[PDB]
């Protein structure tokens, strides 16, 4: 069985950790879990969500081995959005290639107080070349979505 | 101006003389604290003239800056290039 | 602290590393204690827009020789601030080599380092050919050259 | 645009430039400035066909692409002694070794 180890990234209070706790025990407020994607039955291995920004090498080294990346913004925080270029490049410097899997992820979507629209982020990750899912980590909404789709573009990557 | 470079073989080289001065030797053997052709005894010509192609070369693209291309050297002609390089400081 | 080392602006201005050159371009940036730092690499002739800082040191090299290139025309490359949102552009290209040192890649690429010493070369060029290009000892000149 | 050439004549070979827009009467004229001999006794050929004296140099083929610096392009060059016309040869250069071995 093989094995996917996703990190996820994003401003402070994005969600990050919400998306993750309520992907695995389905619950809102160690991170593995065996899910079937595709017919190939897999173990989701989440690697980070904490946003505190840390440049050591060792941290570096931990990023790594991330094989893919939940580039997450909420949408009721415009500079979440803005900074997600930094997380992006910095992704490319730890793995030394161009093309890394990664998901452009908006959270918060069932907050009413929306200042980055849809069709924004839709652009960001059609410039990107990477998929976009709108989730919520409050009301289960993408969540599911969103992990499997950057498992899918892993694989997508191994030609 | 131009400067005459003779190889081995006889072949004749007329080249700029600011091109030629490009490469060390030749300008202390012309141009010295105080002289229009030199003799190269042990440079044939399939030599001689790459070594003036890279003279040309040398003096286009070095104010050249917007993108300069390789200077090819053909495999075959590698080594003997090389030693003319390192006898002409060039 | 070194001479040759980056300077922690904490301005980000956004790049365009550009490589002109016909060579696999490795660029390298000189962290805040000067120590060369690896970056991804840029096939020949590719574009990428950067993410860098003000003040921060940057040269190139070919990833696989570790010749030294130009970048702009300068051996180093410092990214001013961008006016008005404008990126600044890195324009990596091929030095014009002395014909010697073109014709020590040439062999080198041509010839293993173990088989250098059975060529009809002189002794001199052996020690020439395996004087590789190293960037250490690119930025011990450089630093002594900035003695101005 | 420029265009570098290996004007070439027996055993002897000059490396000079011109523009494209240039024609070969002004290459000619370069010629008489270095070998001191009259254009009217010149005649350039590329390859072996012979130039037009009013037709400019990118128009025989000489584009910056083909007459580049690193690898110029040979414009062959016959006299003319009087009414008498040579013929054009030009003497090829020497060979280089076999590659060695050690670089196969
Ligand atoms: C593709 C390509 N082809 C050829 S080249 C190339 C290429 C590829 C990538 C790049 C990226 N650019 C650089 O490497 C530039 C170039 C040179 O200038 C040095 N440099 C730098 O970044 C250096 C630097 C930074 C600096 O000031 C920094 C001032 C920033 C100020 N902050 C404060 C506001 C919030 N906030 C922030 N808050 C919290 C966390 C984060 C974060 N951010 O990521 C990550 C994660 C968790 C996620 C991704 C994976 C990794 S791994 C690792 N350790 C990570 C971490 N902690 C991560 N969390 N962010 C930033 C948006 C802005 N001064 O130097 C670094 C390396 C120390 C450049 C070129
Ligand atoms: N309404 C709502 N709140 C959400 C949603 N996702 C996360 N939050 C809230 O956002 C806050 C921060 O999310 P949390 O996952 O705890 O933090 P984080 O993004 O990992 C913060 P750090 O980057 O410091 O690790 C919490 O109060 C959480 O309840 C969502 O979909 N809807
Ligand atoms: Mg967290």
Same mark, same amino acid.
């Given at each position: 069985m093989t094995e996917y180890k996703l990190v996820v990234v994003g401003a402070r209070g994005v969600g990050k950790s919400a998306l993750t706790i309520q992907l695995i025990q389905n619950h809102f407020v160690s991170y593995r879990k065996q899910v079937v994607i595709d017919g190939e039955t897999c173990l989701l291995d989440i690697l980070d969500t904490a946003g505190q920004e840390e440049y050591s090498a060792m941290r570096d080294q931990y990023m790594r081995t991330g094989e893919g990346f939940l580039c997450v913004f909420a949408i009721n925080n415009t500079k979440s959005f803005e900074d997600i270029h930094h997380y992006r490049e910095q992704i490319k410097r730890v793995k030394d290639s161009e093309d890394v899997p990664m998901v452009l992820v908006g959270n918060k979507c069932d907050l009413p107080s929306r200042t980055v629209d849809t069709k924004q982020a839709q652009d960001l990750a059609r410039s990107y070349g990477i998929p976009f899912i709108e989730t919520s980590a409050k009301t289960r909404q993408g969540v599911d979505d969103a992990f499997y789709t950057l498992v899918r573009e892993i694989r997508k990557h191994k030609e | 101006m131009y400067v005459k470079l003779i190889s081995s073989d006889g072949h004749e080289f007329i080249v700029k003389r600011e091109h030629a001065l490009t490469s060390g030797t030749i300008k202390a053997m012309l141009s010295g604290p105080g002289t229009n052709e030199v003799n190269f005894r042990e440079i044939p010509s399939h030599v001689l003239s790459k070594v003036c192609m890279y003279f040309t070369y040398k003096v286009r693209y070095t104010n050249s800056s917007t993108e300069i291309p390789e200077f090819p050297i053909a495999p075959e002609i590698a080594l003997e290039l090389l030693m003319a390089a390192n006898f002409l400081d060039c | 602290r070194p001479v040759l080392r980056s300077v922690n602006s904490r301005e980000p201005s956004q790049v365009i590393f550009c490589n002109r050159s016909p060579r696999v371009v490795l660029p390298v940036w000189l962290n805040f204690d000067g120590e060369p730092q690896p970056y991804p690499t840029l096939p020949p002739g590719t574009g990428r827009r950067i993410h860098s800082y003000r003040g921060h040191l940057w040269l190139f090299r070919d990833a696989g020789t570790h010749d030294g290139l130009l970048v702009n025309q300068t051996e180093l490359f410092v990214p001013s601030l961008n006016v008005d949102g404008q990126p600044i552009f890195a324009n990596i290209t091929l030095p014009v080599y002395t014909l010697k040192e073109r014709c020590l890649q040439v062999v080198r690429s041509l010839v293993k380092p173990e088989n250098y %010493? %059975?060529?009809?070369?002189? %002794?001199s060029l052996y020690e020439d050919l395996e004087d590789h290009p190293n960037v250490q000892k690119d930025l011990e000149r450089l630093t002594q050259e900035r003695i101005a | 645009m420029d265009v570098f050439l290996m004007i070439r004549r027996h055993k002897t070979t000059i490396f000079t430039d011109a523009k494209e827009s240039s024609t070969v009467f002004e290459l000619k004229r370069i010629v008489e400035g270095i070998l001191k001999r009259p254009p009217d006794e010149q005649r350039l050929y590329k390859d072996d066909q012979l130039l037009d004296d009013g037709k400019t140099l990118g128009e025989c083929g000489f584009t910056s692409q083909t007459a580049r610096p690193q690898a110029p392009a040979t414009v062959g060059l016959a006299f003319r002694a009087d009414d008498t016309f040579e013929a054009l040869c030009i003497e090829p250069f020497s060979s280089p070794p076999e590659l060695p071995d050690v670089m196969k």
């Open positions: - | - | %010493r %059975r060529l009809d070369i002189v %002794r | -």
